[PDB]
Amino acid sequence: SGFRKMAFPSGKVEGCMVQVTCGTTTLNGLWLDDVVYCPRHVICTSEDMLNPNYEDLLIRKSNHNFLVQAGNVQLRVIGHSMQNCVLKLKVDTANPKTPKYKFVRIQPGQTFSVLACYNGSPSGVYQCAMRPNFTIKGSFLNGSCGSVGFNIDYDCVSFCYMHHMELPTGVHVGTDLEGNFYGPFVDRQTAQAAGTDTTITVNVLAWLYAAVINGDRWFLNRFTTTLNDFNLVAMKYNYEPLTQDHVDILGPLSAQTGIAVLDMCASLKELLQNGMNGRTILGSALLEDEFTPFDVVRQCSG
Amino acid sequence: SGFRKMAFPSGKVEGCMVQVTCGTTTLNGLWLDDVVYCPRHVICTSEDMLNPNYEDLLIRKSNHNFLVQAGNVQLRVIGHSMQNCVLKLKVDTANPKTPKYKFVRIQPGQTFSVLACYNGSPSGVYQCAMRPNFTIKGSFLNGSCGSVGFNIDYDCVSFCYMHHMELPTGVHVGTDLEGNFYGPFVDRQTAQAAGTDTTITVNVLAWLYAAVINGDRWFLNRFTTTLNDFNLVAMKYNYEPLTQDHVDILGPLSAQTGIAVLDMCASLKELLQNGMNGRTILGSALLEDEFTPFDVVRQCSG
């Protein structure tokens, strides 16, 4: 037992991380087969980032302007291409360490592991959620751009995130591996509004189930509720509205615990309206929304 | 910016994890050079764990009773030995993936990454602290025994923990890699008292520094305190007493922030006596003690 915010083992991704240099700027890239993926702002000076014309800036670069280094190995760049906001550098060598992989565009509220890297070298791994407003609350310093987020499904690494920018607000934004930003953001150093965030209700419910499974039951109450009544409270507290799809996803956890989804909603309602009276749930004094129903089942069944 | 509970990249450790089977019991082992390390209770039935005589139980085993599997590879066991509470199985092949490594006995209050494994396969990685009372609050299911905790220092993996048991209280206990338990625990299924825990004060101070660095400054106050006055409050709140060694370790963080250690102690005092008034610090509604001063500096300087 016990419940931890758990990342995926990072080895498979560690083998794909490289350093990419173009003029003065250095950041991380992802080396899969004979392609290196990295943020296209690797081609920008710090002055350029105020208002870059990426097409013009890239036209001034040739294959040999891109300096790609895997550990001490140098890769030879034989093609370059811009797809949305990623650069794809064709290199002459297939990464011997390419895992089985897919590129996926995750949905807001889903979770993934981030391997934070600097200069193409891994620093740490942590689990995080794509917020409803498509930001992430990460740990990313200068040089972390191009670090990637992923999930693992048996043997297969599903890459879902490439880090591009820190907003002035301190939250993080980035793209899928086809270079499309999550959310309304652009790769330019301007004020950008993320817009209102909300709490991922189905994940909070999943974590309350996790808590019941682990012995934390103090929040179970004698009430129930309706979907529409619960959603009136969700709206007041800036929780995402609960739908039947969410109810369905919680089914297995409802079955394991013998607690009906709508009864758990009633417990949650009481916590929203009354707080936690200084108590804790799985060591948190707040309601945790960074576990999905799948995260909880994985962790509970090994 | 941003501050996350960050594990070390696990690849180097993933390559050393194997499955060890002896009679019916299967758990994880650590394959380094030509030795496999695993918990000695791999030789126990579930009945044996009430009161095992490990010497007698092992005398009934031969090299060929130990079934060691790395992925699909089978290792051949050519020697077996019990050191304290670990078994050391000599195998005929050196692990080609042995990283540079050391075995270390960490001190209470230090942190490490855990690669949680089942059947010799990695499931997840997370960061945790050795509690003052030498337990850990992990996520460990049946089959996770032999999973290991580690730190990485450049190229070198310092293994510090092997998981052995879940206490009835739900906390986790284990050994260093020489097989000596941390704390007063034994590898027997009996009630075992962990004894009073306390909060790792120097780590809470380190995390308040982390918060200042990241913009969370609301808790900075106009007071200061003495070491002895602060320690009178620490004792009341079951915080470890602060010493000058701890003050010294916080020096670099005091320097970066321009906040004297004793002034940060005064902020902490006020939080202990007044709570957090429903506020948060780095997204936590509680005082976090699972970051060491070194953890904070690593994360702040990449």
Q: How far apart are CA A69 and CA A117, in angstroms?
A: 14
Q: How far apart are CA B56 and CA B59, in angstroms?
A: 5
Structural contact between residues B84 and B58, judged by C-beta atoms closer than 8 angstroms: no
What sign does the dihedral A233-A237-A240-A246 (CA atoms) show?
Answer: negative
Tokens of B257: 């922030």
Q: How far apart are CA B265 and CA B230, in angstroms?
A: 7
Q: How far apart are CA B206 and CA B299, in angstroms?
A: 12
Min Cα distance B146 → chain A (Å) is: 14
Residue with tokens 């089977």: B21
Single-letter amino acid, residue B88: K
Min Cα distance B62 → chain A (Å) is: 31
Contacts of B250 (CB under 8 A, 6+ apart): B202, B205, B206, B209, B261, B264, B293
The values of phi and psi at residue B202, to 5°, are -65, -30
Q: How many CB atoms lie within 10 A of CB A121?
A: 14
Superfamily of chain region B201-301:
main proteinase (3clpro) structure, domain 3 (1.10.1840.10)
Q: How far apart are CA A210 and CA A215, in angstroms?
A: 9
Q: How far apart are CA A19 and CA B146, in angstroms?
A: 35
User: What was the resolution (in A) of this experimentally determined structure?
Assistant: 1.7
**Structure determined via:** X-ray
Superfamily of chain region B11-175:
Trypsin-like serine proteases (2.40.10.10)
Query: How big is the A-B interface in CB pairs under 8 Å?
Result: 135
Q: How far apart are CA B222 and CA B62, in angstroms?
A: 68
| Residue A255 backbone zone (phi > 0: left; psi -120 to 50: alpha; other: beta) | alpha
Read off the DSSP letter of residue A15.
T
Cα angle: B265, vertex B126, A17; to 5 degrees: 110
**C-alpha B32 chain-centroid distance:** 20
Q: How far apart are CA B165 and CA B170, in angstroms?
A: 10
The residue of chain A nearest to residue B285, with distances taken between CA atoms, is A285
* Three-state DSSP class for residue A217: coil
Same CATH fold assignment for domains B11-175 and B201-301:
no
Element (H, E) at B182: none
* Three-state DSSP class for residue B29: strand
Structural contact between residues A68 and A121, judged by C-beta atoms closer than 8 angstroms: no
Query: How many Cα atoms are found within 13 Å in the side-chain-facing hemisphere of A148?
Result: 34
Q: How far apart are CA B169 and CA B191, in angstroms?
A: 9
> Which residues numbered 89-108 in B keep a CB inside 8 Å of some CB on A?
none
Instruction: State whether B2 and A172 contact (CB < 8 Å).
Output: yes
> Which residues numbered 268-297 in A keep a CB inside 8 Å of some CB on B?
275, 278, 280, 283-286
Which residue blocks in chain A are alpha helix, DSSP H?
A: 11-14, 54-59, 201-213, 227-236, 244-249, 251-257, 261-274, 293-301
Q: What is the CATH number of domain A13-175?
A: 2.40.10.10
What sign does the dihedral A147-A150-A152-A153 (CA atoms) show?
Answer: negative
Element (H, E) at A160: strand A156-166
- The DSSP bridge pattern shows strands B100-103 and B156-166 to be parallel
Structural contact between residues B35 and B19, judged by C-beta atoms closer than 8 angstroms: no
Tokens of A301: 């069944």
Nearest CA to B268 out of B200, B208, B198 is that of B208
* DSSP character string of B31-86: EETTEEEEEGGGG--TTGGGS--HHHHHHT--GGGEEEEETTEEEPEEEEEEETTE
What residue ranges do the domains of chain B occupy?
A: 11-175, 201-301
Element (H, E) at B22: strand B17-22
Q: How many CB atoms lie within 10 A of CB B45?
A: 13
- The DSSP bridge pattern shows strands A156-166 and A100-103 to be parallel
Q: How far apart are CA A237 and CA B79, in angstroms?
A: 62
Q: How far apart are CA B150 and CA B121, in angstroms?
A: 17
Tokens of A10: 């990072």
